[PDB]
Symmetry: C4
Subunit: 115 residues, 4 copies
């Protein structure tokens, strides 16, 4: 059987930009994508700690070192600047491999400072 497993997550990042008129996606500092193994154009779930909303979109890269988390397009109705969110991606694989699978998790505090 094939399992769906957490690939990676960015835990408790803060939204830095949110505009309806910008591209419909979530733009993320490439350093953050690197740490969590999340890819350009990959499906992601965003879970909003501040307002409780949960939604799925896809990731794109923002400039390395910018510490940007930009929720744009329709998704701007689901998060505001300052909101604390968790961004996750999932992969599938057979059960035998899933049993020892290790996700890529990065934790954040303050102004999107990775700890």
């Amino acid at each position: 059987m094939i399992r769906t497993m957490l690939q990676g997550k960015l835990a408790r990042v803060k939204v830095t930009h949110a505009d309806l008129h910008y591209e419909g996606s979530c733009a993320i500092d490439q350093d953050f994508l690197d740490a969590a193994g999340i890819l350009e154009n990959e499906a992601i779930d965003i879970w909003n700690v501040t307002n409780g909303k949960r939604f799925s979109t896809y990731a794109i890269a923002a400039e390395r070192g910018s510490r940007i988390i930009s929720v744009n397009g329709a998704a701007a109705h689901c998060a505001s600047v300052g909101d604390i969110v968790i961004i996750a991606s999932f992969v599938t694989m057979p059960d035998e491999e899933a049993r020892t699978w290790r996700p890529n998790v990065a934790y954040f505090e303050g102004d999107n400072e990775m700890k």
Copy 2:
């Protein structure tokens, strides 16, 4: 045993809904030209993200007549989108990680009378 990613296959960005009818059967009918541009297939699962009202839902695509420029929200989804709403329609496909790392989605942007750029 390779790890499989879920990746954006294609999207119709900022198309406008042209028809919505609660009495219909559960689907989104889309001009076949638009399906071609975005690489979306008849009967394929799609997500619809409504830029006008923020609603997000999943359904599936069916073809409308080539050149009709139709975006018709059929069935229960007519509770989530109205004529005139600006939406993003996306499909996702799965593939191994190496392929995902160089994958290019099919993207079509719209303006005006559902005119593609």
Copy 3:
């Protein structure tokens, strides 16, 4: 690439039972499952025409010929007796096969009479 395709659907059935205390699933006349290719224990989406709610659960069989659609457990908060719903399942397959794939669709009217 692997596509997600509509496997089958029951279009515009009416909920006949909805109880929080019964099993958390949707019980469906086996005749209906047969027509739509939907399996016992398969993931299904339910799209509620009456109230607009959309949710995912799994299918179980109800007695053949009963014409039952029973939304139970937590899902009873999302549909009421008399509500009109669309029940769908999805499968994956490679692109080459998906291009000619045909779903199993049954349409309903009146008192869950299949047309």
Copy 4:
């Protein structure tokens, strides 16, 4: 090229939430004994369907100490479930159609102090 079904792998039915904390990091911690009974793995995607309030959400499982009988909703999901709420926790797996047609999910039912039957 065979058609692949999404099937209920396992479920923890009517377990009670024992802890909920918004300040945590995004997961649901579950007594390892419960994970074993339902065939759910650490880091596996799960759905949670809240019988008490009707909310439905997806997250992932992490193990709590064997015998702790913990169901802890961590992070944003604490907006969707509170201590005392009765929930169903499910995981889904994919497999070919023939296997799906005879598949048996791992099911554990609960009562009282998160006592398994």
